Amino acid sequence: VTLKESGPALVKPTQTLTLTCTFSGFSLSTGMGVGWIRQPPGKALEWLASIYWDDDKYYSTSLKSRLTISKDTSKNQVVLTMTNMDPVDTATYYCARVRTDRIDYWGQGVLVTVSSASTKGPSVFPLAPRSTSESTAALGCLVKDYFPEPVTVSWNSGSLTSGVHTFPAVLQSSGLYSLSSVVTVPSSSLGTQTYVCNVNHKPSNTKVDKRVEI
Amino acid sequence: SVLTQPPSVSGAPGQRVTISCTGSSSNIGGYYVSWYQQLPGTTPKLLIYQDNKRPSGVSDRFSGSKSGTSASLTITGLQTEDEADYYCLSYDTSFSGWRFGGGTRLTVLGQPKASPTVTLFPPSSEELQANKATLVCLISDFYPGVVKVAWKADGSAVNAGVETTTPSKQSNNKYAASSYLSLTSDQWKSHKSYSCQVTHEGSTVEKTVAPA
């Protein structure tokens, strides 16, 4: 049972957003259905629409002419269409399974930002250790001036996970985000081992593997 | 046309706590209610469905209560791992589908103070080559989740170029934050010392870096 959303990270105002949820672990049979719920960052969940075995379509009255939902048990997908996108629609969009009714399992959700601003890839700078060496050293990467969210950071291709902490991004008045990811390692380990951050900004189709030397 | 939830509640460790969704004849009265929990940074999880029923694997510290235009979720043996946002859900005969409650943020009151760890990075050699300088002050593992961040240049208060994030709940119920001092390369070289001053619960932790 794995649900998966996919869509554009950035949508311009008044344009159309189209999500598609590819599913696993069932099929629109029985009395089962798949739903769409959104959540603005740090805010409450809002049920949007859902479709059942009947292809019975239910929509939110708050979103009158904007919502169409459709299924395709063939390629096992479920597609929702929202017209006339507004910045108030910026949210994480979840596709969930519904089984009188109840929401059983939730997907990871896709982040969608409705903005008139342009995509911008980040500049990645190393956060080098003097911190006149203590028993541990903090090293990291500064993911600077990007838009929109999100950004993912791993260390050493995911093989280094112990001392990792990626911090939530800051939003400057420029409209550009910046975040820092740092790993705390034993200062004994700064020559034994190389350290590279794997930054991925999918909205700009940019991946950067930056090593942090010294 | 109503679905009211208290935005914040709190209970004592090891005790009981109630989260209530109030409505009318169109929502909870006459239609089933579901409950969902959302831990920080993760997807919601089904708590209670069919008003009273819990699926498998769910803790039996949780339960739902029906009575007219009011639905309630109860949590016995409250523990710190229960701090999360809790939502109710029910259909309404006034609109076409499901309504979510506003959500209730649950706080557990027995947690001890943790003082923040402060890590201050000077600007990189790469960024100075681009004539810019971003000082990075990372604030981790503090409770409760309120800090004041001030910056100093040669001991004197900095009045511009500072941006600090809101505190964010992390894995272990503690909080994290970061603050950035954005300068040019010349401003960075104009002083001998820069300090990140983190005031948590009245005490201050200052870390200093130098261009030299």
Numbering used by the authors:
A (entry chain H): 2 to 34, 35A, 35B, 36 to 82, 82A, 82B, 82C, 83 to 96, ...
B (entry chain L): 2 to 7, 9 to 27, 27A, 27B, 28 to 95, 95A, 95B, 96 to 106, ...
Task: Recite the paper's sentences.
To determine whether somatic mutation was required for the formation of the glycan-binding cavity, we determined the crystal structure of the unliganded DH501 UCA Fab to 2.10 Å resolution. The structure had one Fab in the asymmetric unit (AU) compared to two Fab/AU for the somatically-mutated DH501 Fab in both its unliganded and liganded structures. In a superposition, the DH501 UCA Fv regions had a RMSD of 0.70 Å compared to affinity-matured DH501. The HCDR3 was disordered in the DH501 UCA structure. All six CDRs oriented to a moderately large solvent channel, possibly conferring steric freedom in contrast to both mature DH501 structures where the majority of residues in the paratopes of both Fabs in the AUs were involved in non-crystallographic and/or crystallographic contacts. This difference in crystal formation may explain the difficulty in resolving the DH501 UCA HCDR3. The analogous residues in the DH501 UCA, D56HCDR2 and Y58HFWR3, were appropriately positioned to create the rudimentary glycan-binding pocket. However, the wall of the cavity formed by UCA HCDR2 was collapsed inward as compared to the mature DH501. In total, the initial VHDJH recombination event formed an initial cavity whose shape near the HCDR2 and HFWR3 was optimized by somatic mutation. The full-length IgG of the DH501 UCA had a Tm of 79.8°C, which was 5.7°C higher than the Tm of the somatically-mutated DH501 IgG.
